[PDB]
């Protein structure tokens, strides 16, 4: 199967959204390809797995106004760092048109 | 234009003088550029790309290192620059900061392990 | 013609994108000197020779300043 | 040569119908927002319409000539009283031309 | 050829004259939307009956719209359903699905209806009442200054591409002052004697000034003066001349 | 596809993104010519626009029951807070017309900053709807919420509060 589909899919699981030939078959496990190219994805999917935790956390605690001034200021920093990561991701999307 | 009068234009650009005030610098230029004309080492644009990256990390600029990657995207979208490796390797060599080992960074392969 | 002026558009754009690349690495060449260097690079030329000659000539306009 | 030609100019309008860096080419203002080509053409086409609606038995040629300055010189001299191929003893110029020709006569 | 070419140029001749849109157009996704949506319909299997409208570009609608808002109207865009301006749904642009287009043109037609009713009021005195007649001159003084700005913007199109979302926000501090007048004059357009039809018109302005006691308030103030203008004359006349002799009066108090 | 989108996120939804007051801006047609995962990204982005549509309707009516000069001073500061959501929708479109490789990710990135400003002001507008807040107690529920925990809503609500206090200096000037 062609390389282009995996390259276009994998840049979306860093946000934490499954691709087309990349799906997450178990919650605890990181993102899985649906031979060597198939093996490559495990180190790259750790980033999406780690991203989900911070993103879920700054989702919940930011709109928690019984969580105090500190904690919402914590969320501000977490969200802004996730923003600068999306800045990187936007470039990486634009540099397509398959890229390894 | 012929390449020799282009080297002449270059030596009239850096120096403020014309080629009626100096002929040693332009003869030195024809000495070094000639017999070492037209690249003979590795010429992929990816190799020079990872070294301007190396420079902008060392200057603690993460926005400019990703602005470059979109300037690097636009060169690939159009594709009108005939030697993308050379003019960026030139600009990388003339770099200076706005303000132990280093041979284990990326170096262009010499290609004397192959008859070219 | 027109598509050769559209080629003139794709060269006028690249000459500004390299001008951004030139100032973030802060090379001493302005747009006029860089205009000689890009024509040289089109013909195929060793940057390991050219950077030595530029570092030589810049070492002789600050010695004859 | 290429950076000599690089300093060319281009229009302010950018196309909503071309993408990929359009340098634009300007959709050309309306017909009542042009003149002395479009004015002459409007006069010529209306005159030809009148000629067709008559059959050629009307005959008003020249959608241009006379301009301003020559007519102004002729009318400066008609107050002395002169004849020409414009005095005797566009198409709306006949209305202004009679009112000031009869003054000199 | 020689007259058709000059004609094809100056007058655009693709959305008031049956001739399809001719342009060196290629269109990439950012504006190629209407073709993409038609192709999406065809891929989703309709199956038949294409969508065909007359196909205009974007900037043309802008020039048309500026002319509408200055206080002159009847263009080939914007059909009337009783005289109220609304989206002519026989015209599609190269983008915007024909449905989002409907919404953006709907907002501007909603602005245009208010200018249409103000212009029909100005028309209904020139074919006196001595208050309606004194109201239309204030309305006219606003519309003069409005039309000058919109006409000067139109010159800078000949010299620049502009879209609809620009001209709405660019003209905000005039369309904001007009929206308040849309609420004040709606009770002042509800008209027995000519002096009570003047009093009820004058009093809504009198209350709207005290409501905002700001840039719309100077508009309301300048409009209020021009319809207390007949009353000052008649009150001066009743005092100094020893009589006031007008039909039922132009002052509320009768002798 | 971004001229529908940068008008769908503002007050013109279209037939694709279906506005509703229970939850608006939902895709009703899955485009096969786009990437399959991108639609989820779009819906996340669509959340922001839903708030901006509701915010406009509240301002459209204004400027006992809910009415007064207080509600015409809350809206006036709400105008100034919503202005870089109007400008940031035109500027992107100006960028997109030349550059063809650009994508949805740029818009998601750039309009992430109002998903901290907008939801913490959404509760402020929802409370003034749900309670009968039309009196002099409107300034209390502004000044209690202006302390915030996030830097956009930390500086935003004070601009809004200034206008309502400026209304409170017209009654208290004729009084005093």
Element (H, E) at E134: helix E132-158
The answer to whether residue B69 neighbours chain A at the CB level (below 8 Å) is yes
Partners of A22 in the β-ladder:
A33
Query: Under DSSP, is residue F17 helix (H, G, I), strand (E, B) or coil?
Result: strand
The tokens describing D43, both together, are 């006069």
Query: Under DSSP, is residue E1 helix (H, G, I), strand (E, B) or coil?
Result: coil
The chains found to touch B (3+ Cβ pairs under 8 angstroms) are A, C, F
Partners of F173 in the β-ladder:
none
Give the integer Cα–Cα distance in Å for D101 and E206.
61
Triad B46, B51, B54: Cα angle to 5°: 130
Map F142-159 to HEC letters: HHCCCCCCCHHHHHHHHH
* CA of C42 vs chain D CAs: smallest distance (Å): 11
Are the C-beta atoms of residues E59 and E162 closer than 8 Å to each other? yes
Triad F18, E175, E66: Cα angle to 5°: 85
Whether E97 sits inside 8 A of F89 (CB atoms) is no
Triad E204, E206, E209: Cα angle to 5°: 105
Q: Is A94 left (phi over 0), alpha (psi -120 to 50) or beta?
A: alpha
Which residues are CB-neighbours of B107 under 8 A, at least 6 positions away? Answer: none
Q: Closest-CA residue in chain C for B42?
A: C46
> Beta strands A22-23 and F26-27: pairing type?
unpaired
Question: Does chain E reach chain D with at least 3 CB pairs under 8 Å?
Answer: yes
The tokens describing D84, both together, are 């020409």
Query: Under DSSP, is residue D51 helix (H, G, I), strand (E, B) or coil?
Result: helix
Burial of E54 (0-12, 13-18, 19+ CB in 10 A): middle
Whether C53 sits inside 8 A of B32 (CB atoms) is yes
Q: What sign results for the dihedral spanned by CA atoms D78, D81, D86, D92? A: positive
Which segments of A1-100 does DSSP mark as H helices, in order?
Answer: 3-10, 36-60, 69-94
What is the DSSP annotation of E75-123? Answer: -SSS-BSSS-B---TT--BSSSTTTHHHHHHHHHHHHHHHHHHHHHHHH
* CA of F172 vs chain A CAs: smallest distance (Å): 34
Measured in whole angstroms, how far is the alpha carbon of residue F131 from the centre of its chain?
Answer: 20
Which residues are CB-neighbours of E23 under 8 A, at least 6 positions away? Answer: D15, D17, E57
Which residues are CB-neighbours of F163 under 8 A, at least 6 positions away? Answer: F73, F74, F76, F77
Partners of F26 in the β-ladder:
F18
Q: Is E92 left (phi over 0), alpha (psi -120 to 50) or beta?
A: beta
The tokens describing D76, both together, are 């400066």
**Helical pair B86-93 and C3-24, crossing angle rounded to 10 deg:** 30
The tokens describing A63, both together, are 């709109």
From first CA to last CA, the distance across chain B in angstroms is 28
The tokens describing B12, both together, are 């009239």
Give the integer Cα–Cα distance in Å for B92 and B51.
8
Q: What is the radius of gyration, based on Cα positions, of chain B?
A: 18
Are the C-beta atoms of residues E59 and E161 closer than 8 Å to each other? yes
Triad E27, E29, E33: Cα angle to 5°: 85
- Please tell me which of the candidates D16, D28, D45 has its beta carbon nearest to residue E161: D16
Closest CA to D21 of E60, B76, C12: C12
* Cβ count within 10 A of residue A62: 23
Give the integer Cα–Cα distance in Å for A74 and A45.
26
Which residues are CB-neighbours of F66 under 8 A, at least 6 positions away? Answer: F128, F129, F132, F133, F134
Task: Catalogue the long-range contacts made by B79-82 (C-beta closer than 8 Å, 24 or more residues apart).
Answer: B80/C7, B80/C10, B80/C11, B80/C14, B81/C14, B82/C41, B82/C42
Q: Closest-CA residue in chain B for F98?
A: B74
* CA of D7 vs chain C CAs: smallest distance (Å): 8
* CA of C17 vs chain D CAs: smallest distance (Å): 14
Q: List the 28-67 stretch of E: residues with Cβ below 8 A of F.
A: 28-31, 33, 36, 40, 43-44
The tokens describing C8, both together, are 């003139």
Experimental technique: cryo-EM
**Helical pair A36-60 and A69-94, crossing angle rounded to 10 deg:** 150
The tokens describing E139, both together, are 């309305």
Four-CA torsion F76, F78, F84, F85, nearest 10 degrees: -130
Give the integer Cα–Cα distance in Å for A4 and D42.
60
Burial of C62 (0-12, 13-18, 19+ CB in 10 A): exposed
The one-character DSSP state at C45 is B
Closest CA to D105 of D84, D82, D76: D82
Whether F1 sits inside 8 A of E30 (CB atoms) is yes
**Helical pair C47-57 and B86-93, crossing angle rounded to 10 deg:** 40
Residue found under tokens 């290192």 = B65
Give the integer Cα–Cα distance in Å for B56 and B66.
9
- Please tell me which of the candidates E95, E169, E179 has its beta carbon nearest to residue F3: E95
Whether F36 sits inside 8 A of A20 (CB atoms) is yes
Give the integer Cα–Cα distance in Å for D91 and E147.
33
Neighbour-count burial for F60-86, b at 16+ CB within 10 Å, e otherwise: eebbeeeebbbbbbbbbbbbebbeebb
Are the C-beta atoms of residues F69 and F24 closer than 8 Å to each other? no
Number of H helices, E strands in chain D: 4, 0
Q: Closest-CA residue in chain F for E178?
A: F63
The answer to whether residue A22 neighbours chain F at the CB level (below 8 Å) is no
Element (H, E) at F95: helix F84-96
What is the DSSP annotation of A73-87? Answer: HHHHHHHHHHHHHHH
The answer to whether residue E209 neighbours chain F at the CB level (below 8 Å) is no
Closest CA to F10 of F121, F150, F111: F111
> Beta strands F17-18 and A32-33: pairing type?
unpaired
- How far is residue A36 from each of residues A3, A39, B115, E252, measured CA to CA in Å? 12, 5, 33, 96
The one-character DSSP state at E56 is B
- Please tell me which of the candidates E44, E100, E179 has its beta carbon nearest to residue F14: E100
The one-character DSSP state at E17 is S
Are the C-beta atoms of residues E64 and E77 closer than 8 Å to each other? yes
Q: Is C40 left (phi over 0), alpha (psi -120 to 50) or beta?
A: alpha
Are the C-beta atoms of residues D33 and E11 closer than 8 Å to each other? no
Give the integer Cα–Cα distance in Å for A38 and E228.
85
* Cβ count within 10 A of residue B71: 17
The answer to whether residue A48 neighbours chain F at the CB level (below 8 Å) is no
- How far is residue E54 from each of residues D1, E93, E106, measured CA to CA in Å? 45, 9, 19
Query: Under DSSP, is residue E233 helix (H, G, I), strand (E, B) or coil?
Result: helix
The tokens describing A20, both together, are 């087309």
Task: Catalogue the long-range contacts made by E44-52 (C-beta closer than 8 Å, 24 or more residues apart).
Answer: E44/F29, E51/E92, E51/E98
Residue found under tokens 């001739």 = E19
Neighbour-count burial for F22-33, b at 16+ CB within 10 Å, e otherwise: eebbeeeeebee
- How far is residue E159 from each of residues D12, D18, D92, E147, E165, measured CA to CA in Å? 8, 19, 32, 19, 20
- Please tell me which of the candidates D16, D24, D34 has its beta carbon nearest to residue E31: D16
Q: List the 69-108 stretch of E: residues with Cβ below 8 A of D.
A: 94-95
Closest CA to B27 of F23, C56, E110, C1: C56
* CA of E134 vs chain F CAs: smallest distance (Å): 27
């Amino acid at each position: 199967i062609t390389e282009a589909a995996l390259v276009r899919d994998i840049l979306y699981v860093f946000q934490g959204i499954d691709g087309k030939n990349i799906k997450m078959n178990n919650t605890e496990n990181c993102y899985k390809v649906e031979r060597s190219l198939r093996d490559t994805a495990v180190r790259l999917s750790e980033l999406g797995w780690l991203h989900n935790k911070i993103r879920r956390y700054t989702d919940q605690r930011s709109l928690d106004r019984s969580f105090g001034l500190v904690g919402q200021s914590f969320c501000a920093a977490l969200h802004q760092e996730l923003r600068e990561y999306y800045r990187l991701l936007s470039v990486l999307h634009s540099q397509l048109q398959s890229l390894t | 234009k012929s390449p020799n009068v282009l080297l002449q234009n270059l030596c009239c650009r850096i120096l403020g003088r014309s080629e009626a005030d100096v002929a040693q610098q332009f003869q030195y230029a024809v000495r070094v550029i000639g017999s070492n004309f037209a690249p003979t080492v590795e010429r992929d644009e990816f190799l020079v790309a990872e070294k301007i990256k190396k420079e902008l990390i060392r200057q603690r600029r993460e926005a400019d290192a990703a602005l470059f990657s979109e300037l690097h995207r636009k060169l690939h979208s159009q594709g009108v620059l005939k030697n993308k490796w050379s003019i960026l390797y030139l600009l990388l060599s003339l770099s200076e900061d706005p303000r132990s080992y280093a041979t284990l960074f990326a170096q262009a392969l010499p290609r004397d392990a192959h008859s070219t | 013609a027109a598509a050769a002026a559209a080629n003139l558009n794709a060269v006028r754009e690249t000459m500004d994108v390299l001008l951004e690349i030139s100032r973030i690495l802060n090379t001493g060449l302005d747009m006029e000197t860089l205009s000689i260097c890009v024509r040289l690079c089109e013909q195929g030329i060793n940057p390991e020779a050219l950077s030595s000659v530029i570092k030589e000539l810049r070492k002789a306009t600050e010695a004859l300043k | 040569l290429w950076e000599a030609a690089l300093t060319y100019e281009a229009s302010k309008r950018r196309c909503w119908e071309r993408v990929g860096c359009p340098p634009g080419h300007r959709e050309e203002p309306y017909l009542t927002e042009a003149g002395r080509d479009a004015f002459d053409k409007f006069c010529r086409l209306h005159q030809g319409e009148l000629q067709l609606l008559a059959g050629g038995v009307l005959q008003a040629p020249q959608p241009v000539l006379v301009k301003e300055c020559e007519l102004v010189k002729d009318v400066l001299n008609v107050l002395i009283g002169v004849v020409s191929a414009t005095f005797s003893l566009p198409e709306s110029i006949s209305s202004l031309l009679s009112e000031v020709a009869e003054y000199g006569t | 050829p020689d007259d058709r070419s000059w004609l094809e140029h100056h007058v655009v001749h693709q959305y008031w004259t049956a001739r399809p849109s001719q342009f060196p157009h290629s269109l990439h996704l950012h504006s190629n939307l209407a073709a993409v949506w038609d192709q999406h319909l065809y891929s989703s299997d309709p199956l038949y009956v294409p969508d065909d409208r007359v196909l205009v570009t974007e900037t043309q609608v802008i020039r048309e719209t500026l002319w509408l808002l200055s206080g002159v109207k009847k263009l080939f865009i914007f059909q009337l359903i009783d005289g109220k301006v609304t989206v002519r749904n026989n015209i599609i642009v190269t983008h915007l699905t024909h449905s989002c287009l409907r919404s953006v043109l709907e907002q501007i037609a909603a602005y245009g209806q208010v200018v249409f009713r103000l212009q029909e009021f100005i028309d209904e005195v020139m074919g006196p009442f001595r208050t309606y007649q004194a109201f239309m001159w204030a309305l006219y003084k606003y519309f003069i200054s409005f039309k000058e700005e919109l006409a000067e913007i139109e010159k800078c199109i000949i010299n620049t591409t502009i879209t609809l979302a620009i001209v709405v926000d660019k003209l905000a501090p005039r369309l904001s002052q007009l929206k308040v007048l849309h609420k004040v004059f709606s009770t002042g357009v509800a008209e027995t004697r000519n002096v009570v039809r003047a009093s009820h018109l004058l009093n809504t302005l009198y209350k709207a000034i005290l409501e905002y006691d700001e840039q719309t308030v100077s508009l309301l103030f300048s409009l209020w003066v021009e319809t207390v203008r007949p009353y000052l004359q008649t009150v001066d006349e009743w005092i100094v001349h020893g009589h006031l002799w007008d039909g039922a009066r132009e002052f509320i108090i009768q002798r | 596809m971004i001229h529908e989108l940068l008008l769908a996120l503002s007050g013109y939804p279209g037939s694709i993104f279906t506005w509703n007051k229970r939850s608006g801006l939902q895709v009703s047609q899955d485009f096969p010519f786009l990437h399959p995962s991108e639609t989820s990204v779009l819906n996340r982005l669509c959340r922001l626009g839903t708030d901006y549509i509701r915010f406009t309707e509240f301002i459209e009516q204004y400027t006992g029951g809910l009415h007064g000069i207080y509600l015409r001073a809350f809206c006036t500061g709400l105008d100034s807070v919503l202005q870089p959501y109007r400008q940031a929708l035109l500027d992107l479109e100006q960028e997109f017309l030349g550059d063809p490789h650009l994508s949805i990710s740029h818009v998601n990135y750039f309009l992430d900053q109002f998903q901290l400003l907008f939801p913490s002001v959404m509760v402020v507008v929802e409370q003034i709807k749900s309670q009968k807040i039309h009196g002099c107690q409107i300034l209390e529920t502004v000044y209690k919420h202006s302390c915030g925990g996030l830097p956009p809503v930390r500086s935003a609500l004070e601009k809004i509060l200034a206008v309502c206090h400026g209304v409170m200096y017209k009654q208290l000037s004729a009084w005093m």
